[PDB]
Design an enzyme around this catalytic site. Structure first.
Site, PDB file in Angstrom:
ATOM      1  N   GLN A  40       1.232   9.522   1.166  1.00 10.07           N
ATOM      2  CA  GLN A  40       0.934   9.626   2.621  1.00 10.07           C
ATOM      3  C   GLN A  40       1.834   8.771   3.499  1.00 10.07           C
ATOM      4  O   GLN A  40       2.054   9.148   4.617  1.00 10.07           O
ATOM      5  CB  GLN A  40      -0.504   9.168   2.976  1.00 10.07           C
ATOM      6  CG  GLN A  40      -1.531  10.063   2.348  1.00 10.07           C
ATOM      7  CD  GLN A  40      -2.922   9.149   2.124  1.00 10.07           C
ATOM      8  OE1 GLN A  40      -3.732   8.660   0.937  1.00 10.07           O
ATOM      9  NE2 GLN A  40      -3.266   8.997   3.710  1.00 10.07           N
ATOM     10  N   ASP A  96       0.813  -1.208   0.000  1.00 12.58           N
ATOM     11  CA  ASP A  96       0.000   0.000   0.000  1.00 12.58           C
ATOM     12  C   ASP A  96       0.844   1.255   0.000  1.00 12.58           C
ATOM     13  O   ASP A  96       0.531   2.252   0.732  1.00 12.58           O
ATOM     14  CB  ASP A  96      -1.028   0.004   1.131  1.00 12.58           C
ATOM     15  CG  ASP A  96      -2.117   1.097   0.915  1.00 12.58           C
ATOM     16  OD1 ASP A  96      -2.411   1.476  -0.280  1.00 12.58           O
ATOM     17  OD2 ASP A  96      -2.639   1.597   1.944  1.00 12.58           O
TER      18      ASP A  96
END
Ligand SMILES: *CCC(=O)N1CCN(C(=O)OC(C)(C)C)c2ccccc21
EC number: 2.7.11.22
Length: 292
Positions: free
Chosen positions: A127, A123
């Site tokens: 961020q 993932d």
């Protein structure tokens, strides 16, 4: 407790994240409480235990793991900003190319290390790329997706982004090879260069079709086996491939060649992190100091 809250850093995938201070050592840390849907899963046990030993200068250090009241608190080293915020801050001018090159080079070193231990991120996104004021960038939350799964929504119902997800995951294959992280890093590379997300899909089919519109609808010639993927549909519209020259100007020819290899459809064809480190794009790599 052992840790005093300083302030809320934000919401993570799995729970709230606080900046906190360790009472006894005085160190400042990012403390992630893991909220899951009976005790911690033994999968989570095995995976988190491997992560305490998966140490590298481009991996945010997992300092400690506290397991109490049948919940995990992961204690990470603290870094002051993420790449998402830094890109937004640089939108008028863009991140300078020598710094983009340094960041890519360091992230590939972190990937090469974890991949050689058979751990993947799964993932990767801006961020969870964290930077310090000296010039380093580090991968955050490495390994958490195998430990806990990747939810559709976070615990506070925020949508988990699909923009960096590899086509084999979008087409429903449940085997993730280390290639999935190279794909995400290629998408992030293109975003740093152009100052626009490459494939900002808002649903699985919108994400796939954005990929197809740029790279061509995949077929058996470019990706042997694609038509056997669980979610492949013979009725997908057929779009032709665009040239990368139009996709990532003003990136030079070495950078465009590297990007195209990180974005090969077939995970068996996609460049590995180790090969990417030897690419001529990095012949002149340096380590600049960022402004922030
Ligand atoms: C999700 C499983 C997987 O690794 N697959 C799926 C199909 N595939 C493939 O080659 O299937 C046959 C044609 C051999 C049946 C393939 C191809 C490339 C990458 C991943 C997969």
């Amino acid at each position: 407790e052992n840790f005093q809250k300083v302030e809320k850093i934000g919401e993570g995938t799995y729970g709230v994240v606080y900046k906190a201070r360790n009472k006894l050592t005085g160190e400042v840390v990012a403390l992630k409480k893991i909220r899951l849907d009976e005790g911690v899963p033994s999968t989570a046990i095995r995976e988190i235990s491997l992560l305490k030993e998966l140490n590298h200068p481009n991996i945010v250090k997992l300092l400690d793991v506290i397991h109490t009241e049948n919940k995990l608190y992961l204690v990470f080293e603290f870094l002051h900003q993420d790449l998402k915020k830094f890109m937004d801050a640089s939108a008028l001018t863009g991140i300078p190319l020598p710094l983009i090159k340094s960041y890519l080079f360091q992230l590939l070193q972190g990937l090469a290390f974890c991949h050689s231990h058979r751990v993947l991120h799964r993932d990767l996104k801006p961020q969870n790329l964290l930077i310090n004021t000296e010039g380093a960038i580090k991968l955050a939350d490495f390994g958490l997706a195998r430990a806990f799964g990747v939810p559709v929504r976070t615990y506070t119902h925020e949508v988990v982004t699909l923009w960096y997800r590899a086509p084999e995951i979008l087409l429903g294959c449940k085997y993730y090879s280390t290639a999935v992280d190279i794909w995400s890093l290629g998408c992030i590379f293109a975003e740093m260069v152009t100052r626009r997300a490459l494939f900002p899909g808002d649903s699985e089919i919108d994400q796939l079709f954005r990929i197809f519109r740029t790279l061509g609808t995949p077929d058996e010639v470019v990706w042997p086996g694609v038509t056997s993927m669980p979610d492949y549909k013979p009725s997908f519209p057929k779009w032709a491939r665009q040239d990368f020259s139009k996709v990532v100007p003003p990136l030079d020819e070495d950078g465009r060649s590297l990007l195209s290899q990180m974005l090969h459809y077939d995970p068996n064809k996609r460049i590995s992190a180790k090969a990417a480190l030897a690419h001529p794009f990095f012949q002149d790599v340096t380590k600049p100091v960022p402004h922030l």
